[PDB]
Amino acid sequence: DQVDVKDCANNEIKKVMVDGCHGSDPCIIHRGKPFTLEALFDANQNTKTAKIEIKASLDGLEIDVPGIDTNACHFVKCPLVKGQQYDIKYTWNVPKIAPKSENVVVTVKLIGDNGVLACAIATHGKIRD
């Protein structure tokens, strides 16, 4: 079920949803289900390069993107520009995780060289219901 995450790609994304979590409000998520967040988009800018600012924090899964790649390349089709379609992502193997997580926080943003290819932020996020 999609949600209401404040994305900032360009009203061009082809599919941006999140397996349970709730967008906009304090993204509350559920346990026992794969919270594979996502957000696709067809490169419409013009830059073979690319940047990134993703940040997913999970109790036993502290996703993070402090600069792992060198230009949204090791994570996606580096060259976005307006001549390529591609789908970043952040799967989620969900065991049980119990209710409520020690802490959580979702955020994201793709920046080529002309603007922000994509974006997604879940102000606060508590597991449980």
From Swiss-Prot:
What is any one of the record's Gene Ontology cellular component terms?
Answer: extracellular region
| Xref: InterPro entries | Ig_E-set, ML_dom, NPC2-like
What would be an example GO MF term here? sterol binding
Q: Which Gene3D superfamilies match?
A: 2.60.40.770
Q: Where in the cell is it found?
A: Secreted
The UniProt entry's sequence similarity note says:
Belongs to the NPC2 family.
Query: Could you tell me which PANTHER family the record lists for this protein?
Result: NIEMANN PICK TYPE C2 PROTEIN NPC2-RELATED, NPC INTRACELLULAR CHOLESTEROL TRANSPORTER 2
The remark listed among the other comments is:
The sequence shown here is from clone 2. The N-terminal sequence (AA 1-8) from clone 1 and 11 are not yet known.
GO biological-process terms attached to the record: sterol transport
The name this protein goes by in its record:
Mite group 2 allergen Der f 2
> Which SUPFAM superfamilies has this protein been placed in?
E set domains (SSF81296)
Native organism is Dermatophagoides farinae
Pfam families reported in the protein's UniProt record: E1_DerP2_DerF2 (PF02221)
Q: Give the intrachain disulfide bonds.
A: 8-119, 21-27, 73-78
Q: Which UniProt keywords apply?
A: Allergen, Disulfide bond, Secreted, Signal
